[PDB]
Structure 1
Amino acid sequence: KPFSVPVLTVEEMTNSRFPIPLEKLFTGPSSAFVVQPQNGRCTTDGVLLGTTQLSPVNICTFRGDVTHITGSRNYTMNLASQNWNNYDPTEEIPAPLGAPDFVGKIQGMLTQTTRADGSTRGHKATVYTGSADFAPKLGRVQFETDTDHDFEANQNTKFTPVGVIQDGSTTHRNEPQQWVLPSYSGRNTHNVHLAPAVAPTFPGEQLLFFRSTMPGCSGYPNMDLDCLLPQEWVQYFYQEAAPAQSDVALLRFVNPDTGRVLFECKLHKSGYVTVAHTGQHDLVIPPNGYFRFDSWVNQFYTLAPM
C-alpha cells in the first residue's frame, strides 16, 4: 500500500503532546515564537523524532520510585523506563520519551503500589517542568503533592497527567508556555538530540496546528495546545513507513456533506503542515471531514488560499 494519511476526522484523533483528544484546526503566524515541539514529531516515512513515541496515554507520564524531601510536600522521583526497568541517560534522546515538551505546571496524580501486600495510595501532584530541578534527562523530576508522609520509598510510583494550572496572582493565561522547551537536564544545561524547529518559508504560508484544550485544574491557565502532527498520524507513518517521493505531500481536506474540497495544505516530509493564510484563524470544518493525500509536490508549490 502506497503512502497515505489515515481517514480519521479531527475529533476522532488525539493530541500528540498531551493525552487528550483533538478539538479543532487552527492556523496563525509563528515568527514571534519558536515552533520546536519534541512530542508529535515524525517524518512521513515513519521516523520518530525528539521525544516522540507511539503511546498516546504515556505522553506526559512519569514512572519510578520517590524519595521524600523533608520539610516539604515535595518528592523527587528517580525515573524508571516506561517498562519499569532501569533508566539509561546515555540514550541519544532529549529526554525519556513522552516527556513534556513545554514549560508549564502539569497537575495530575501520583500513585503507588506496595509490592508486599498490594496496598495502594493516590495523591494529587503537580510538576513544574520549568523548575531548575526538572531534569528528566538525568532521570529526576520533582512533584508538589499535598502529603508529607504517605508515599513509601523504593516502591513503583506513577504520575498520570490530567491538566495544567496557573498562578492567579499574576497575569492570566501567562502560563503554561507551550512553545518554550524545558531544560531536560535542569537549569543552565543545553538540550541535545532535539527535533529541529520548524518555520514556514514560502510566502503567504502559516503553520496548520492540530489544537486541543488542556484541562485547567487551578487558576487562569493558557489551555491551548498545538501539535504539528496528530498522534494517529505518527502511529500511521511509523506503521506504513512509506518513503517520500518528494519534499511535500499535498493534502486535500474533503467535505462529505457537500463533496467538495474545503481547503488544501502542504504536509512536509519532515512532519509538519502549512496552509496559505495570513493571520490568526480557527478553521470551521465539517465534523465528518478528513484529510486525503492527493499528490507528491515540491516545497514551492502554490497552495490555494484558505
Structure 2
Amino acid sequence: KPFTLPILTLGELSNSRFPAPIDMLYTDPNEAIVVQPQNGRCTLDGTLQGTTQLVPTQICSFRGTLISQTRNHPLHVQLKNLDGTPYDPTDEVPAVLGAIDFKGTVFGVASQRNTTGNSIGATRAHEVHIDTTNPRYTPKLGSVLMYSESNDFDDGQPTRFTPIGMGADDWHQWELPEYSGHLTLNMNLAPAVAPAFPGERILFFRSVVPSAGGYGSGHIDCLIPQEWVQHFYQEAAPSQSAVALIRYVNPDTGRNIFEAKLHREGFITVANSGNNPIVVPPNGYFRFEAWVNQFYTLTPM
C-alpha cells in the first residue's frame, strides 16, 4: 500500500494542537530546538501517540462532571473521555486524550446541560479559563480545575470545556504540564523530536489563535496537521524507511518549491536557509516522492 499525503492546501488544513486553521509554515529563525508535544502525534504508518485523538474540534477540550467545592470561582471537573466513555487512569497515555499539552492559561467556555435534579435539560454557559500550571491541573489523575467570574454552574452536572484562546500572556507551548500534579512525573509520553543534523530545522504548521487581553501572539505550532493525523491513522501504509522524502509542489504546473524530510515518527525537517518567512503558492501542497534514509542531504528551502 503506497504511502500518500492529503492534497489539501495550507488554507484547508487544521492545527492538531488547537482547534484552529493553519495560517503559515514556520521554522525557528534563531536556532534549532527540541519539542515534545503530545497532541498531533501520529507515526507515518498510523500509530497515534501521546494524548492524540482524531476529532479536530475536540483538541484541548475537556468533558466531565462538575464537583462543588469543600472573584474567581473554582470549578473542579471530574473527567471522562471526550467521546463520552469513562476515563481510565490506568490507560498507557500521558493524560486524557485531547488534554492541553503545554503550560499556559487557556480561556474558553464551560457549558452544562443538566441530566439529574429538579431541572433536567436546563442549560448554562460562561467564560472560564484553565491554568495548566495549577497544581490541580491533573488530567492524568482524571480532573482539572477551571476558574470563572461566574458562579452560575450546577453541582454534579455534565460540564464541557471548549477552548478559545489565550487567557493570559503566559504561554510556553513547548513546556509540558505536570499531567499528574507536582508530585508525580509524566509517563507514556510521545518522544521528543529534533533535527538529527546541524543545518536542519523542524518545519511547523503554525496557527495564530485569539487572546482575551494583553499582547500575546497566540502561536501554536504542530508537527503535522490534524488531517494528516486522520489520514495516516486510516491508511496505515507501511513505512519503507525512517525518512520519506517529500516536496511542496504546485499541482497546476508540477513545479517543486522545496524538499523536506518527513520522518517516520511524524514530523518534518527542512534544510536551514536562515531568513524571513516561507513563501509557498496557495494552491500547493506536500507530495510524497520517495523513501530515503537519514544520510539524505536537503537542499536549503
1:299 aligns with 2:294: yes
Q: Which residue of 1 aligns with 2:136?
A: 133
TM superposition outliers: structure 1 runs of 4+ over 4 Å: 29-33
Q: 1:280 to 1:135 in 2, by over 3 A?
A: farther
Q: Which residue of 2 aligns with 1:34?
A: 34
Partner deviation per Cα, 1:58-100 (whole Å, 9 max, x = no partner): 1000011112336851111111122333321011100001111
Residue 134 of structure 1: CA displacement?
Answer: 0.6
Q: Which residue of 2 aligns with 1:213?
A: 208
User: Amino acid of the residue matched to residue 202 of structure 2?
Assistant: L
Q: Which residue of 1 aligns with 2:109?
A: 109
Q: 1:282 to 1:188 in 2, by over 3 A?
A: farther
Q: Which residue of 1 aligns with 2:163?
A: 161
Residue 31 of structure 1: CA displacement?
Answer: 5.8
Q: 1:72 to 1:252 in 2, by over 3 A?
A: closer
Cα distance in 1 for partners of 2:192, 2:243 equals 17
Q: Which residue of 1 aligns with 2:231?
A: 236
Cα distance in 2 for partners of 1:187, 1:226 equals 26
1:15 aligns with 2:15: yes
Q: CA RMSD in A?
A: 1.7
Q: 1:131 to 1:120 in 2, by over 3 A?
A: same
Residue 281 of structure 1: CA displacement?
Answer: 4.3
Which stretch of structure 1 is more off in the superposition, 154-163 or 82-91?
82-91
User: Amino acid of the residue matched to residue 123 of structure 2?
Assistant: T
Cα distance in 2 for partners of 1:203, 1:142 equals 42
Cα distance in 1 for partners of 2:56, 2:236 equals 19
Cα distance in 1 for partners of 2:26, 2:222 equals 10
Q: Which residue of 2 aligns with 1:60?
A: 60
Q: Which residue of 2 aligns with 1:252?
A: 247
- Report SS of the residue matched to 1:191: coil
Which stretch of structure 1 is more off in the superposition, 251-260 or 283-292?
251-260
1:119 aligns with 2:114: no
Partner deviation per Cα, 1:148-176 (whole Å, 9 max, x = no partner): 2x211111110001111325xxxxxxx21
Q: 1:209 to 1:292 in 2, by over 3 A?
A: same
Q: Which residue of 2 aligns with 1:89?
A: 89
User: Amino acid of the residue matched to residue 73 of structure 1?
Assistant: H
1:266 to 244, 248, 261: 261
TM-score (norm 2): 0.94
- Given that 1:165 and 1:219 are in contact with CA atoms closer than 8 Å, whether structure 2 keeps it comes out as no
Percent identical among aligned pairs is 55
Cα distance in 2 for partners of 1:131, 1:51 equals 19
TM-score (norm 1): 0.93
- Report SS of the residue matched to 2:11: coil
Q: 1:33 to 1:268 in 2, by over 3 A?
A: closer
Cα distance in 2 for partners of 1:269, 1:51 equals 18
2:145 to 142, 145, 151: 142
Cα distance in 2 for partners of 1:248, 1:184 equals 31
- Given that 2:206 and 2:220 are in contact with CA atoms closer than 8 Å, whether structure 1 keeps it comes out as yes
- Given that 2:54 and 2:229 are in contact with CA atoms closer than 8 Å, whether structure 1 keeps it comes out as yes
Residue 34 of structure 1: CA displacement?
Answer: 3.4
Which stretch of structure 1 is more off in the superposition, 31-40 or 182-191?
31-40
Cα distance in 2 for partners of 1:246, 1:286 equals 29
Cα distance in 2 for partners of 1:70, 1:222 equals 37
- Report SS of the residue matched to 1:50: coil
User: Amino acid of the residue matched to residue 241 of structure 2?
Assistant: S
Cα distance in 2 for partners of 1:58, 1:158 equals 10
Cα distance in 1 for partners of 2:194, 2:177 equals 20
- Given that 1:59 and 1:99 are in contact with CA atoms closer than 8 Å, whether structure 2 keeps it comes out as yes
Cα distance in 1 for partners of 2:66, 2:296 equals 53
2:192 to 167, 173, 197: 197
Q: Which residue of 2 aligns with 1:286?
A: 281
Partner deviation per Cα, 1:22-71 (whole Å, 9 max, x = no partner): 01001126867530000111100000011111111110000111123368
Q: 1:78 to 1:30 in 2, by over 3 A?
A: farther
Q: Which residue of 2 aligns with 1:172?
A: none
- Report SS of the residue matched to 1:11: helix
- Given that 1:131 and 1:187 are in contact with CA atoms closer than 8 Å, whether structure 2 keeps it comes out as no
Cα distance in 1 for partners of 2:11, 2:114 equals 39
Query: Alignment length, in residue pairs?
Result: 298
Partner deviation per Cα, 1:210-237 (whole Å, 9 max, x = no partner): 1000111222223111101111111100
- Given that 2:41 and 2:50 are in contact with CA atoms closer than 8 Å, whether structure 1 keeps it comes out as yes
- Report SS of the residue matched to 2:125: strand
